[PDB]
């Protein structure tokens, strides 16, 4: 229930109240406010600043660098889920900051002679990999067909650190799993945050008339021209005025919208961008979508083929997708690490040691199979010992969306520094 | 203090608790939960879901379409600000949803014979335009030089609806204004939300070691290669493994990083993107930054030159910037409107009528000079009468960042529809 000095300075600035005016309005001591900027109070500040208490509240957890969970504790979290009249899955949770979404390990208990009843799907996309040792069935449709029923294999060969096939569970499409045969099997399902969730959360609160107008604008093929027209209408420009505004021939502007990726088109849309004040990059094409799981599907052979040395590690790729840049999965063989976002790790073999440099100096924890850890963004760490660990990644900060704003910022490091002190 | 059905379904799904399990854990009636999904309770749900009450709280205001404020009320909000020992400005606020940041009108009271003492700057970038009738001085530096002292002119000619020069106040740089002479003058300063604020808010909570690591990564020239290396390290790939992974010659990958905008480079980075699972677009170059206000500066002549017909309106442009796509300003002459984001309007001449189609059917309000209104995203509206109104725009939803994720979504309209019902 603490106060965020950053959120407070922002609101005093917004309402342009001096420190003294803020204290006088809020009805509390000035040394306190000069301290907060550096319970019974928070309510007053909120009132004096015309904002809800949650708009000034600090984060539930500050200075988190690493969080870990032993094999014993992950096993202790086991929880059975009943579906279709039987013990369908066994629920386990991996390391994750308190309150956050934790990666999940699942026992696949639905026999091969019974179609696995589907769940209702979910917004977040997720990387799912078969830990083995048995093969499993993937179901993505009511009707059983090659497009909605496929075997997610377990590695039966020698390079076991590559545990099995993996793919990306598409956002919102129902799915379920069953055993492909007798051999038991476990699955690891890692979800990243939804990058469209913030928009949805807001759109859900708009009037229904506006919501329908938004859907209308998003309906159909969202081409470069359709997005551009919205940008122009946003600026009270027509395609004609915008063209003469950018000094471009209407004939070429039409071509570029037909070829955003051609160098002729990119030069035009960027020239438009500079003239009208917008970022041409979001106008560039992205690989169309498929709606099936055949595009992201990554077999054991794919992963084996992708093997490479990464520092003191040997790495292999899990399923990925160009339209889900913040979601990553990787097979790591062990015998410094620092990503621009969060990492979720789970050991699959050997007694490994994770070390990290945190607030209290160097630290470390020994983790055995099913043991796991979570690293915050930019937290330098490393793994020692001989074994295997799965490397997952997610996080909105800093996601590919932040990287787009960052390339648009003058001296980003300076901006961040100013915000922190 | 209500509950968000969307945030609740998300958390029950995350923790994968059935409706019954949720009710049993939360300790409340099941019909209630089946109702919320469709005070004393919210606390229980939060506890049972291992989340803070704010993580399930609905928006302070739902179904807002339009908010307006009369000339009399905006005049009634006048507030003097003392600086450098004198009455420096007069503070006025324009229409805005309760709790939100309201556009500001300022009387410039610092005489021409006194250097206007600077403020401490602010994170949000802002479009500032001179309402006139007198010219004013702009100060952007301690020392008075051509780069930090320039006259922001007021239109003294006939097309008064174009009120004067405008420019973009760069994020965080101190600034202030004084009169250029005897003639009085008012200014309108419109700020958009900061697109980097979310990242900052989070980075402020990271350990200092991680923060320093982040600054290090952002320091220097943030080129296509420097961002790519982070993407690769994120995926346990080196430039060598990534190349052979995308089936590209190391020699070409180096060229593309030297020419992201050339069609040869874009084809490579997109091929890399498809292979490694990332969005090549954020790798594309954006116009460098300047740090001065000479790039966005828009004179009266510029605006006059940009005049164009827009539906039943005559429009002229205010200052803009390619790196601030969500911030827009426009001069509108009156005698349907629907943007993909929020609008803030302020009348400068005539008694005008704003109509909108809201939750209760068609509505309308008559606004005179200094009167203002705010429209939510996608809210269809129009202006009737003969006069002039300033059109400002901001909002994160849906900003250019959302448009990047939207082009990456399969059936976005469908996704949003599912989230709402």
Curated annotation (Swiss-Prot), chains A, B:
<feature type="binding site" description="in other chain">
    <location>
        <position position="91"/>
    </location>
    <ligand>
        <name>substrate</name>
    </ligand>
</feature>
<protein>
    <recommendedName>
        <fullName>2-hydroxyethylphosphonate dioxygenase</fullName>
        <ecNumber>1.13.11.72</ecNumber>
    </recommendedName>
</protein>
<dbReference type="InterPro" id="IPR010982">
    <property type="entry name" value="Lambda_DNA-bd_dom_sf"/>
</dbReference>
<dbReference type="InterPro" id="IPR011051">
    <property type="entry name" value="RmlC_Cupin_sf"/>
</dbReference>
<feature type="binding site">
    <location>
        <position position="175"/>
    </location>
    <ligand>
        <name>Fe cation</name>
    </ligand>
</feature>
<dbReference type="GO" id="GO:0017000">
    <property type="term" value="P:antibiotic biosynthetic process"/>
</dbReference>
<keyword id="KW-0479">Metal-binding</keyword>
<dbReference type="GO" id="GO:0008198">
    <property type="term" value="F:ferrous iron binding"/>
</dbReference>
<dbReference type="GO" id="GO:0003677">
    <property type="term" value="F:DNA binding"/>
</dbReference>
<keyword id="KW-0408">Iron</keyword>
<feature type="binding site" description="in other chain">
    <location>
        <position position="169"/>
    </location>
    <ligand>
        <name>substrate</name>
    </ligand>
</feature>
<feature type="DNA-binding region" description="H-T-H motif">
    <location>
        <begin position="19"/>
        <end position="38"/>
    </location>
</feature>
<feature type="binding site">
    <location>
        <position position="16"/>
    </location>
    <ligand>
        <name>substrate</name>
    </ligand>
</feature>
<dbReference type="GO" id="GO:0016702">
    <property type="term" value="F:oxidoreductase activity, acting on single donors with incorporation of molecular oxygen, incorporation of two atoms of oxygen"/>
</dbReference>
<feature type="binding site">
    <location>
        <position position="122"/>
    </location>
    <ligand>
        <name>Fe cation</name>
    </ligand>
</feature>
<comment type="similarity">
    <text>Belongs to the non-heme iron-dependent dioxygenase family.</text>
</comment>
<keyword id="KW-0223">Dioxygenase</keyword>
<feature type="binding site" description="in other chain">
    <location>
        <position position="189"/>
    </location>
    <ligand>
        <name>substrate</name>
    </ligand>
</feature>
<keyword id="KW-0045">Antibiotic biosynthesis</keyword>
<keyword id="KW-0677">Repeat</keyword>
<dbReference type="GO" id="GO:0042803">
    <property type="term" value="F:protein homodimerization activity"/>
</dbReference>
<comment type="function">
    <text>Non-heme-dependent dioxygenase that catalyzes the conversion of 2-hydroxyethylphosphonate (HEP) to hydroxymethylphosphonate (HMP) in the biosynthesis of phosphinothricin tripeptide (PTT), also known as bialaphos (BA), a natural-product antibiotic and potent herbicide. PTT contains the unusual amino acid phosphinothricin attached to 2 alanine residues. Synthetic phosphinothricin (glufosinate) is a key component of commercial herbicides.</text>
</comment>
<feature type="domain" description="HTH cro/C1-type 2">
    <location>
        <begin position="227"/>
        <end position="283"/>
    </location>
</feature>
<feature type="DNA-binding region" description="H-T-H motif">
    <location>
        <begin position="238"/>
        <end position="258"/>
    </location>
</feature>
<keyword id="KW-0238">DNA-binding</keyword>
<dbReference type="GO" id="GO:0042802">
    <property type="term" value="F:identical protein binding"/>
</dbReference>
<feature type="binding site" description="in other chain">
    <location>
        <position position="119"/>
    </location>
    <ligand>
        <name>substrate</name>
    </ligand>
</feature>
<feature type="binding site" description="in other chain">
    <location>
        <position position="175"/>
    </location>
    <ligand>
        <name>substrate</name>
    </ligand>
</feature>
<comment type="subunit">
    <text>Homodimer.</text>
</comment>
<dbReference type="GO" id="GO:1901766">
    <property type="term" value="P:phosphinothricin biosynthetic process"/>
</dbReference>
<keyword id="KW-0560">Oxidoreductase</keyword>
<dbReference type="InterPro" id="IPR001387">
    <property type="entry name" value="Cro/C1-type_HTH"/>
</dbReference>
<feature type="domain" description="HTH cro/C1-type 1">
    <location>
        <begin position="8"/>
        <end position="56"/>
    </location>
</feature>
<dbReference type="GO" id="GO:0032923">
    <property type="term" value="P:organic phosphonate biosynthetic process"/>
</dbReference>
<dbReference type="InterPro" id="IPR014710">
    <property type="entry name" value="RmlC-like_jellyroll"/>
</dbReference>
<comment type="pathway">
    <text>Secondary metabolite biosynthesis; bialaphos biosynthesis.</text>
</comment>
